[PDB]
Amino acid sequence: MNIFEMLRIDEGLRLKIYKDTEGYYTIGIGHLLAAAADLAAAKAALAAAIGRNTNGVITKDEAEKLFNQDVDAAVRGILRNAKLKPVYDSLDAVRRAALINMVFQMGETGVAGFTNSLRMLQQKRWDEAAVNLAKSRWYNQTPNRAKRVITTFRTGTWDAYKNL
């Protein structure tokens, strides 16, 4: 399993350009193309990003490419972050997947705020952290995503995502 698939599940994948209620142009896995207006403008960007002249629809491989771009950017920022870097750095690949997922959902700052939970994580206190975290507003608001992710932090496996 992989992070793209995790996110596919948690966030969702759109293969056709979408405009939300607040005027944003998005595609793939939350890939922001453009805020206001120009569908054509949005399509223009798209076309350039994947290196192809779409009709507004892309393939999964194409989404995966934009996503990977987005994942890097996020990891960059994670690194330039002082509350986040040592955790990331100390986590295993799977668990970071989870870390990234959270960032994708709530931003670095948002994540950066789970001081205690982060601490356990860095000191490898998995059940601790897991329990800590389930007592959160985040969990109450997006419980299904919260739970998988948490469970992921717990086991360090991808099982939460294979058993749906």
* CATH code assigned at 157: 1.10.530.40
CB count within 10 Å of CB 163 equals 8
| Residue 136 assigned ligand-binding role | no
For this entry, resolution in Å reads: 2.3
CA separation for the pair 119, 7 (Å, rounded): 24
Q: Which of 18, 40, 45, 43 is nearest to 29 (CA)?
A: 18
Q: Which two tokens stand for residue 117?
A: 């939970």
Instruction: Find the domain containing 100 and state its range.
Output: 1-164
Catalytic residue (one of 5, 10, 20, 22):
20
Spell out the residues 6+ positions from residue 132 whose beta carbon is closer than 8 angstroms to its own.
116, 117, 120
CA separation for the pair 85, 74 (Å, rounded): 12
Structural domains in the chain (count): 1
Catalytic residue (one of 11, 70, 127, 128):
11
70 is catalytic: no
108 is catalytic: no
Q: Let me know: does 112 contact 83? Beta carbons within 8 Å.
A: yes
Q: Which of 90, 23, 27, 22 is nearest to 56 (CA)?
A: 27
Q: Let me know: does 58 contact 27? Beta carbons within 8 Å.
A: yes
